[PDB]
Amino acid sequence: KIDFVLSVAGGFVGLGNVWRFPYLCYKNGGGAFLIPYFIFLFGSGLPVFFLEIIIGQYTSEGGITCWEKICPLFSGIGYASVVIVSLLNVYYIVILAWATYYLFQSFQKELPWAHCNHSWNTPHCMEDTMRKNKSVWITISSTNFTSPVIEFWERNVLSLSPGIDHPGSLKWDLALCLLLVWLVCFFCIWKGVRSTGKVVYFTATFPFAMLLVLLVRGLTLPGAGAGIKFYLYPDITRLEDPQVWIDAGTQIFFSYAICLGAMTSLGSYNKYKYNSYRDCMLLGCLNSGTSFVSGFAIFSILGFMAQEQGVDIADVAESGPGLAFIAYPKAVTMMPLPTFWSILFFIMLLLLGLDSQFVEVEGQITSLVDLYPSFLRKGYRREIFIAFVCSISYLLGLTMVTEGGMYVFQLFDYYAASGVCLLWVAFFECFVIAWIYGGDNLYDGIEDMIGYRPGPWMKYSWAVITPVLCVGCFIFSLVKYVPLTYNKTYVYPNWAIGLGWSLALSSMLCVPLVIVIRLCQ
């Protein structure tokens, strides 16, 4: 019970609610993102999560083992999830590397991004406190100016190249930060160091307090009403593009850590005769509320920056993966004693990232050791195996810390553990569960375990709402095609789009291979 609650709280509350949701909501106009957000929430987000928990508790297994007894022909979902989490682990730790770099740069007397008198800055820079001044406003030369935070993030941390075709030279300091984070993760996993006893009280109450104070600071900031209006009121015409629907569905499937093979094991740890339904509903509501209030804070900050800079809200930031690193460092600057609050906030980010990183990597290593235990479970191989896995992941992720490392990271974010592959996996899971096993068969088990019969809503949500949404989104995306573009102006080469589609197809095509191999034998 207690361990279940703590593990599930640490299993999906983290970067997916604070970093990824805000920039996807910002890129799609704001309010128009919310209607598909809630539709997909109440259609599949809670039903599929509850289905995973129930199947884990019922089979007492996870990963491929549960599908090995639910449907042998449909065991490819486990392998697809393994590939998805393996590709996700590579690019999930670059955020932690950036956080470590920011934290190390925080120890100085003055924050580096508070001004742009440094040496890594273009001549087209000035301070936001007087950017709206008449001599430096729409009167003349108001289009090519830039804020110190944008220039810092684009040059000191990234040093962005003209394109992906020009990778430049490798940056060594970010490589060292990545190595340090990987070493910390290896030390934590090898010795089995997890929060226990009374320290978990602070570990759980610190991120919420930091989020609360950040929310208060953002709400008290002038010009946040425009940000709230942008975040809430939707655009009807914008809904005619499949982009909003597909990214809302993937945000639902990502924030809840669905289709990664983790919740099945989490429910497998549970025993029979437990009320999983109430806990699952409460956790889903808590996760959604946390994301909603985090969006409040982000868009209040964005509205403040848009009001102070003099430009429109739709284009005031990167509109890409690095939205948090532009909003939050700008927010922590307004607090008294900025250094202490910056250190606290980046420690909070590190804490929210490290626990999720640990649990995902541990689940991955358990999956691989279960895949071939014959000599893995015997001897001292269970240290060198993690050593090799960490080294390979570090080498693979080293390609995203070069001069042109942002484009590869954006391609990974778009095509690796999101987009069409997650919809594919969720559609297949819902289809098999609802149509081959039978909803009545699962309600029999639910009645046996929890002693009560829920309403006739899970059956519908698994039979008619999820497959229709998945198929509609896929078909409409295929019919109306718009190629991926970093930010909004950069157009990718043909081979880059081919590589991204190959990345997605690598996860997607595991299921047909499994089916054809099972049928051939």
Ligand X SMILES: CC(C)CCC[C@@H](C)[C@H]1CC[C@H]2[C@@H]3CC=C4C[C@@H](OC(=O)CCC(=O)O)CC[C@]4(C)[C@H]3CC[C@]12C
Contact residue for ligand NAG among 133, 220, 485, 487 (CB under 6 A):
133
Contact residue for ligand X among 138, 286, 371, 478 (CB under 6 A):
371
**By CB under 6 A, which span of 80-88, 95-103, 117-125, 262-270 interacts with ligand X?**
80-88
**Which partner, Na ion, ligand NAG, ligand X, none, binds residue 167 by CB below 5 to 8 Å per kind?**
ligand X
**By CB under 6 A, which span of 115-123, 200-208, 428-436, 507-515 interacts with ligand X?**
507-515
- What is the rounded distance in angstroms from the CA atom of residue 23 to the CA atom of residue 199? 33
**Which partner, ligand X, Cl ion, Na ion, none, binds residue 408 by CB below 5 to 8 Å per kind?**
ligand X
- What is the rounded distance in angstroms from the CA atom of residue 222 to the CA atom of residue 227? 10
- What is the rounded distance in angstroms from the CA atom of residue 377 to the CA atom of residue 143? 62
Residue ranges in 327-356 that form contacts with Na ion under rule CB under 5 A: 355-356
- What is the rounded distance in angstroms from the CA atom of residue 148 to the CA atom of residue 137? 17
Nearest to 125 by CA among 135, 113, 116, 136: 116
- What is the rounded distance in angstroms from the CA atom of residue 18 to the CA atom of residue 12? 11
**Which partner, Na ion, ligand NAG, Cl ion, none, binds residue 356 by CB below 5 to 8 Å per kind?**
Na ion
Give the count of residues interacting with ligand NAG (CB under 6 A): 7
270 lines the binding site for Na ion (CB under 5 A): no
**By CB under 6 A, which span of 3-11, 159-167, 235-243, 261-269 interacts with ligand X?**
159-167
- What is the rounded distance in angstroms from the CA atom of residue 117 to the CA atom of residue 113? 10
3-state DSSP assignment of residue 293 = helix
Residues listed for the chain: 521
390 lines the binding site for ligand X (CB under 6 A): no
Amino acid at 514: V
Residue ranges in 244-283 that form contacts with Cl ion under rule CB under 5 A: 255
Contact residue for ligand X among 3, 165, 173, 447 (CB under 6 A):
165
Integer CA distances (angstroms), 521 to 49, 75, 79, 231, 507, in order: 33, 15, 19, 54, 23
CB of 107 to ligand X, least distance (A): 33
420 lines the binding site for ligand X (CB under 6 A): no
124 lines the binding site for ligand NAG (CB under 6 A): yes
130 lines the binding site for ligand NAG (CB under 6 A): yes
Report the Cα 5 to chain-centroid distance in Å: 21
Residue (123 or 379) nearer to ligand NAG, CB: 123
**By CB under 5 A, which span of 289-297, 298-306, 323-331, 491-499 interacts with Cl ion?**
289-297
| Full DSSP string of 54-111 | HHHHHHS--THHHHHHH-GGGTHHHHHHHHHHHHHHHHHHHHHHHHHHHHHHHTSSS-
Binding site for ligand X (CB under 6 A): 79, 82-83, 86-87, 164-165, 167, 371, 396, 399, 408, 502, 505-506, 510, 513-514, 517
